[PDB]
C-alpha cells in the first residue's frame, strides 16, 4: 500500500473546472468560469504540486466538465515528463473514477506507472478556503505550478502515516464544516500559523484534542 518503497501520488481533479452562476436582470443564467487547480499529492513526503488552471484554457470550448478530466491528465503527464525518472511516481491514485481513462491514454509512454481509483474521502477542495491557497488560485492570471509541503514540520516528530491521518482529518473537517473546523484548529488566542506553514503550531496535547474534535465533526 502507501508508505513503502514506492513513490505514490494522489491526483484530485475535482477543482479544475469551477464556475459561478448568476441570474441576470433579464432573468437568464450566466455561467462564468473561475480559476481552478489540480492537486497532486505525495502522502509519504507531504509534497503537494498545485497546478493552477487559469480560465483562459476553456476558450470558447464546450462540455468543459469532461474536457477538464483530459486537461488534468495532460498536466499530470507534463509534470511527469519534467521530472527525472527517479522522481516519477510508481503509482497514481485518482480520487475520481472519471480520471481513469484520460490518465491511461496520456501515460502510455510510462508503462511502469500503475493507475488506480479509490473510495477514499480526500477533499482537497477544502484547501480552496485555506487563505494561502484560495487567494493564490483566485488571483492567478495564467497557469502555473506551486510547490507546498502539506505536513509543515510534523515529520520531525511523527511518521508519514501519522501525518497523513492528521491531514485527512483536517481536510475532511474543513470540507464538512469550514467555520467550525477553523475554530477547532485555533484552540488558544495565542495560536498562530507560521508564514511558511499551512497549519497551526499546536502542542502535542493540543493536537490530541483537535484530532478527536475533527473526527467528531466529520461523524456529525
Ligand atoms: Cl468522476
Ligand atoms: Cl503548470
Ligand atoms: Mg528524493
Curated annotation (Swiss-Prot):
<feature type="region of interest" description="RNase H homology domain">
    <location>
        <begin position="1"/>
        <end position="220"/>
    </location>
</feature>
<comment type="subunit">
    <text>Part of the U5 snRNP complex. Component of the U4/U6-U5 tri-snRNP complex composed of the U4, U6 and U5 snRNAs and at least PRPF3, PRPF4, PRPF6, PRPF8, PRPF31, SNRNP200, TXNL4A, SNRNP40, DDX23, CD2BP2, PPIH, SNU13, EFTUD2, SART1 and USP39. Component of the U5.U4atac/U6atac snRNP complexes in U12-dependent spliceosomes. Within the minor spliceosome, which acts on U12-type introns, interacts with PPIL2 and RBM48. Core component of U2-type precatalytic, catalytic and postcatalytic spliceosomal complexes. Found in a mRNA splicing-dependent exon junction complex (EJC) with SRRM1.</text>
</comment>
<feature type="region of interest" description="Involved in interaction with pre-mRNA 5' splice site">
    <location>
        <begin position="1"/>
        <end position="220"/>
    </location>
</feature>
<comment type="function">
    <text>Plays a role in pre-mRNA splicing as core component of precatalytic, catalytic and postcatalytic spliceosomal complexes, both of the predominant U2-type spliceosome and the minor U12-type spliceosome. Functions as a scaffold that mediates the ordered assembly of spliceosomal proteins and snRNAs. Required for the assembly of the U4/U6-U5 tri-snRNP complex, a building block of the spliceosome. Functions as a scaffold that positions spliceosomal U2, U5 and U6 snRNAs at splice sites on pre-mRNA substrates, so that splicing can occur. Interacts with both the 5' and the 3' splice site.</text>
</comment>
<protein>
    <recommendedName>
        <fullName>Pre-mRNA-processing-splicing factor 8</fullName>
    </recommendedName>
</protein>
